[PDB]
Symmetry: C9
Subunit: 190 residues, 9 copies
Amino acid sequence: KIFVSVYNIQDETGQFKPYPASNFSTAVPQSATAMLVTALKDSRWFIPLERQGLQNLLNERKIIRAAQEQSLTAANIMVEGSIIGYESNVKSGGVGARYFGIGADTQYQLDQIAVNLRVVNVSTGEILSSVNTSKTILSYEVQAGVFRFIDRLLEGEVGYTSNEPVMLCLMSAIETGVIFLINDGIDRGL
Amino acid sequence: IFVSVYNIQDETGQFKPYPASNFSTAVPQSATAMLVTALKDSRWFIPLERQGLQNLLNERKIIRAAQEQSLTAANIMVEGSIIGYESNVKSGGVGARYFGIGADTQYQLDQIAVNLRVVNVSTGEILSSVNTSKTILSYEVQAGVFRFIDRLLEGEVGYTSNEPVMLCLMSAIETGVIFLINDGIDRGLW
Amino acid sequence: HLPAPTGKIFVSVYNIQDETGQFKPYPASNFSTAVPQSATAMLVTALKDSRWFIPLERQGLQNLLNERKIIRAAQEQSLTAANIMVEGSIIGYESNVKSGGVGARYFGIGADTQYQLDQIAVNLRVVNVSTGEILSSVNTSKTILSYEVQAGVFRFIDRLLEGEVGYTSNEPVMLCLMSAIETGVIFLINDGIDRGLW
Amino acid sequence: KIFVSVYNIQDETGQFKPYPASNFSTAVPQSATAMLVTALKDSRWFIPLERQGLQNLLNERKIIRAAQEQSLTAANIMVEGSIIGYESNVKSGGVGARYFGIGADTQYQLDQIAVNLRVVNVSTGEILSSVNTSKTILSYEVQAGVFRFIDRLLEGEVGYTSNEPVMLCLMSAIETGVIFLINDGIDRG
Amino acid sequence: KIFVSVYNIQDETGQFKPYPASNFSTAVPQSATAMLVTALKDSRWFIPLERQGLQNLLNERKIIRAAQEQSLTAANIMVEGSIIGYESNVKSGGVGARYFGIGADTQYQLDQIAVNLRVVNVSTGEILSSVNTSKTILSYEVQAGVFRFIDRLLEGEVGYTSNEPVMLCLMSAIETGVIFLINDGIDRG
Amino acid sequence: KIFVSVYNIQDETGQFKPYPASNFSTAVPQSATAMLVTALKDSRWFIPLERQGLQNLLNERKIIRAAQEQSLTAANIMVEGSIIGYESNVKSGGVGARYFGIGADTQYQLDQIAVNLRVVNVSTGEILSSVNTSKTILSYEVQAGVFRFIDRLLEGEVGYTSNEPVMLCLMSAIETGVIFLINDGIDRGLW
Amino acid sequence: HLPAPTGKIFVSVYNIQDETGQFKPYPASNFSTAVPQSATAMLVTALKDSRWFIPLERQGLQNLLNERKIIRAAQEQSLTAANIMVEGSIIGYESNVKSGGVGARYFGIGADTQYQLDQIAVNLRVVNVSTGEILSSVNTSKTILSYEVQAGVFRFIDRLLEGEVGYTSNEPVMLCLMSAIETGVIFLINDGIDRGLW
Amino acid sequence: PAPTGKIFVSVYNIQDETGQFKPYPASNFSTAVPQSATAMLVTALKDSRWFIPLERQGLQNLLNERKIIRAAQEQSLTAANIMVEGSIIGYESNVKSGGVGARYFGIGADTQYQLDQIAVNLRVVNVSTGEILSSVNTSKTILSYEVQAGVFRFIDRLLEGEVGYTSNEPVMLCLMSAIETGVIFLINDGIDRGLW
Amino acid sequence: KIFVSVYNIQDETGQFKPYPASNFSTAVPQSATAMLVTALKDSRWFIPLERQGLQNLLNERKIIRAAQEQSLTAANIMVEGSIIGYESNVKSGGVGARYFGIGADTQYQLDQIAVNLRVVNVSTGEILSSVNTSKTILSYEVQAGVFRFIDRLLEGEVGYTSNEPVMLCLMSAIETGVIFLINDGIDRGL
Ligand SMILES: [Hg+2]
Ligand SMILES: [Hg+2]
Ligand SMILES: [Hg+2]
Ligand SMILES: [Hg+2]
Ligand SMILES: [Hg+2]
Ligand SMILES: [Hg+2]
Ligand SMILES: [Hg+2]
Ligand SMILES: [Hg+2]
Ligand SMILES: [Hg+2]
């Protein structure tokens, strides 16, 4: 098992959800340095060293130094990087048709999440490896309806919409980004 | 065991869309209450406070002064954050109208994920981490009648329900603690 | 069997901050909180009316502390502590949760009604001072009822006639909190019953 | 007469007037710890100690003291607390009817102010008492009108609208707010 | 004459102009401690002591002290307080009528300004008195016009509008409070 | 000549222009201590001591001091005060009339501005005088038009709109206050 | 009679800041000033091109002062001052002030024209360094014209015909300030001529 | 071109100097360009190896960690002889943009396109003397287009249909491309300098 | 070759794009002190001293010095100055005409950018020279269309819109600005 100290990985996309959505609400989740901290632990052997998060674990330790009137492991590597980019439509499209009296239609869009991960050495400060990874996000809407006349009248509508959970594919993106960093480490091999 | 939780912050970076005020977070910031109570009510666990600590510390200074008796710590620590939130994710609905009775039904789903990490104090290594995700159901149903006599007759009835997003977080923050202890079964640290 | 406490206990309640992170929607200004920040008043009056408890204040500490700088200076005499602490926060607020309504119209009389319910949760914690352990904590959750009722008449003569009546009531969210926090201290005291700590 | 040191009572309702009014404009005045003070002054026995406001007086004291090259009274109690809350519509309603060609109608809304005061002992710093007093605020609108045809035409409208002064409705709130605190000192004493 | 040191009186109304007017524009002038400092000056016997403003006079005095290589007058009372509250409609209304073809109508609104003024002693730091005075702000609009057909057509419009100067009424409000503060010192005396 | 130091006079009107205007744009200029300082100097006798502005003058005198390895005149009085208020419509209104087919109309509004200037003694810190002055601001719009038929058609339009320079009536106010500030001093005299 | 200067004068101008407090209206972003902040460039170029005068910098002072720190380090030589000082501000901006336009249409040819005038004001003070007294001050004010003309044709055939032409010009406000500030330096120099200070 | 050799490159920050934000509907707070430089840049130099990026993103976290190591014992840190700096110079659109379309009864069809421009400033600056060795401004372009085709027809009954496709190039990627050629060019200027 | 220390040139025009564009987006890039620096570099002889940018190199020098348990060049001049102005429409206009059934039209807007550069001596701290150079920025639109009836119907549309890349056009301005600053240094000559 190798000790990895990862402090923080910030959303650098600078991108925000469009109207009607709140202009304050980021279009990308800040869950990185959790998603990352777990995905290393799930890739075990790796033993995430916390430091999220350190000043809390530091406050606690004062108390244990106090209550008694015992050391703290470091990592010989470190991981870093950030969320690179997000946008849409990227590549997007759709079709639809209506005849008397039945209409139907379907639309879809893609998005692109990118993540930069870099394994950096602790002692020498040299960046041992860095990779940029990008996944894509699907969304689609489907509708069908009938307008028919009798004399009287008749109509009907059905629809289904699916939007891939941006949080989830970041994870996949930030997962695969872990997979890479390992390959980079194996031929080293450290 | 004695457990000290410091903070779990909303990392979702989301805010409720229009009509809602652009300042309203889409998810409640109340974790480190939800987590503190989920540990207590799942006892054995004994929360160490630390909300909040500076208050308790201010108070201990007062007692000391008028007197002119130590403070219990935790050997593990719980951390993590709210990973993500969104909607519609998967969503949809149907409806139909005949002369003159119409009726229709719609539904939305949301998701929320949380990251809960037990980390050792003494050596500061992360003992375990979990990402748990719940979903949030919303729905609306309506029925109505438009009919003529000659004069007229019409009627409408409807019911709308949104799952209490705060309470799904409770559900979500709960099921993580269960798992976190289950890893603690084979750990054991006990 | 039988329970029993002993005597009064001193409680220091510093702050309960609103964690709901919520603000009324439009037409209301985005700056108006959807929930009052008034807890640690409601909680405090709860404790003083629910005596035997002597809230130690500390709202509020600094103002008293400067005031003690004053008195001491005019003369050229100690300050009571608390044995426990109440803490915790407003867990969250929202709507519509459950909500709905009905209505119907015939010629020419129409009528309708609607209602919404809001869910508030509150978390209160009693934590010991000396050893700093949390003695107990409780999550309590109210709902908030609002409703509207309307009736009207559109009728022709030839000439015309119409009429409208309506009533709208929203339960004062402030009070639900006042009520939420009321049920929260009831509970907390019951564990102190079996405790006692008194 | 007792010396009361009254520092701050802050608006905790966190409420702001809705559209059309500016989103920065509070739904309730911030003026308490004045209204509270004028209550205490005109409610004697009491002698409000200032401390608003303090540094202004504290600075001024340096000037006198310097120009001379003589002490400052205390208060045995402290009055504190906040504005618990505000809201509307709470309860509201109204009616109206129109016949050819005279219509007439009326509406009303009720608003709610709550106030928390607390008397805390200075010497030991224990809370002596606390009071939550909530008044209500009436608003109403009255209208009458006529649309009449001749051929030629005629119409008329008269209307009157009123909202109570929430500034004032707080004054009554804070006035009875003081009453109960005096009483808890009647039985204390 | 009595020396009155007066530092600052803040607008506490928490009130802002509605739409279309800028949401950053106060509903009430920030002019106090001018309107107050001129009021006392015209109310003589009085000698307002500045302190607006003190730091400019304080910097300036370094310059006089440094140019030489002589004392500073203090006051035994102090005036304080704030602008308590503002709002409208309060009382409001209007009427109008239109016949073929002459129309006419008129409307009015009232606004409410309140002021807290306290006289406090500087030596012992006790509030000597405090007063809450209030005035109202009248606005009105009058319109009349003619729409008539001939065959061709004819129309005409006249209108007049007036809004009372909220800045003026505050002066009016901040004035009477001074009249009040004087009395309470007379029977004292 | 008298030495008069004036530090700063701020816009206290608390007012901002309505829509369409940028909500950030102050309805009244922050130009006081420019208009004021010159109204004292242009109406001389008086000798403005700067202090706008003093922080810079003091940085400069550091530079003189450094290259050499000599005093600074003061004022016996000080002027102060600020911009009291601005508003509308105050008094306002207008007329218009149209016949077939020629229309014409005119509209007018007034605004008010007040300014507070106070002469304060330096040595004792007494206020030697205080004055509130008020100007008013005129805005008017005039139009005329013709809609007439032939059968084909005809129409025409003309219009003109004047808004008095709010910046200027601040100046106009800031002078007349200084004018009055001098008069009261003639019976003081302090001059 | 007869006037005369003697030699070049050293001027330090630190800041002349926009005091207009004016912002462009809609459709502009609320954030865009209606006047450039470029004074203390405009002033300085005016003084360098209207030389004899020697702008002393001090914009800017820290960049130069941080740079002198470097040289003095790299070697291990004095700094010229100014004898006068130029100050003052941008006193204001506005519109519409005086504005207007006309137009007419007949079948089917229309035409129209509109125009606005703006007013900028600038205050420039010369204040002596050694004694701190203000030697002189000016308020200068330019105007800024904007105009628009358009003409068109709506005609029928049966088929159809129409046409549109138009031209709009808005004076470069930035420049009027440069013009406003120019006239302000000329006046000042004049009084200096009869002073002389030279 | 070539390695040798390895050169230590310590790159600190390259910040977006375009000062540009997305239009309506998208939030007025959202940048029209990534903040990802000094990631995009650091990985550029590394895949153009030989270069040995020295981190310093990022230095503070590596610094606390070194306090941890040093404390757990109660051992040096490599420097770089050159440095890269600079910024993302500018962004905009329409710049060059256009489109066409035509409809006959009852088939319509149409297409539109827009171009965007991204500029990057990279600089190689010497450490020892603190002198600029080089600076280069490289710019890419970003394509967007929309294609649609549709049918409105009558029978009596009726018929309609619509098909469409839209593509907007990833401004993230173009900047990654810009910064890439930006590095390429920077090599050549060192290729003839040389310092390498 | 003369050593030139170039620090900062800030946008003083205070301009921001109109609606629909965000109210936060400047009408002019902030990238000068790059555009100026590369100008000097390519107008060489000039040896720009960095100082963008200084503190990163300064922090870097703490590392090398300390890695060992070698001096830092000056400049005798300084380039300073600012972006004087930006605006529009300045001059703008356009025409168009339509006959049955062919229409067409064309439009144009011109923008003005101004720049102030200044050379200032270090040793005595005098401004040696200052230049104001102002370019313009061209924007034009072209449309043509056809509406014709048959019975049946026909229509067509073609268009082209170009605005000049103000970023480039700032370089154009900032370049010619160096000409005059070099030129006044010809007769200086320093
Ligand atoms: Hg995905
Ligand atoms: Hg749930
Ligand atoms: Hg309730
Ligand atoms: Hg009332
Ligand atoms: Hg009045
Ligand atoms: Hg005027
Ligand atoms: Hg001009
Ligand atoms: Hg690309
Ligand atoms: Hg250009």
